[PDB]
Ligand binder design. Structure first.
Ligand code: EMC
Ligand code: EMC
Ligand code: EMC
Ligand code: EMC
Lengths: 90, 90
């Protein structure tokens, strides 16, 4: 299908303080594609039609989150969500 | 420990004629790092310590290649190399 799809993300770990640049790669990306990162909608930008750059949001609490894709307030469910582990320095 | 390594490549397939923009994600990337497509070495452009950008070199014959990294004429090899598949239009 031509539905947006995440292959992998790097880095897949980051501090709770956030702000680190994450690259999401996969299939069928387009400008306007929204990225949802631990439930927060983040600013994003296509590097190519196969790569997206986002900054990690801050997160109150350490642990695994999902990275998913959405457009016009409607999420896509093709494939496997990106997985990102927040860690606390503290 | 601090060694450049490939997690994934997007897209992982290209035409034998080369020139395609490819994003490679991983860890420990830096300025001046080079990429080997089977036997062909190309330059990269750093995006973050976790992603680089290359243009695929042409390959005379279609097929699967191992993708590895290099710096100062010295190839790295940590973990599982990347896989890129050349396809012919003909
Ligand atoms: C299911 C391939 Hg991004
Ligand atoms: C978990 C359904 Hg997009
Ligand atoms: C530890 C292989 Hg990027
Ligand atoms: C041939 C695996 Hg460094």
């Amino acid at each position: 299908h031509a539905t947006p799809c995440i292959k992998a993300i790097s880095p897949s770990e980051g501090w709770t303080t956030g702000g680190a640049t994450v690259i999401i790669i996969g299939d069928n990306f387009f400008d306007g594609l929204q990225v949802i990162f631990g439930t927060m909608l983040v600013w994003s930008e296509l590097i190519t039609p196969h790569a997206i750059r986002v900054q990690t949001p801050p997160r109150h609490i350490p642990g695994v989150v999902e990275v998913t894709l959405s457009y016009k307030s409607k999420q896509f469910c093709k494939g496997t969500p990106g997985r990102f582990i927040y860690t606390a320095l503290n």
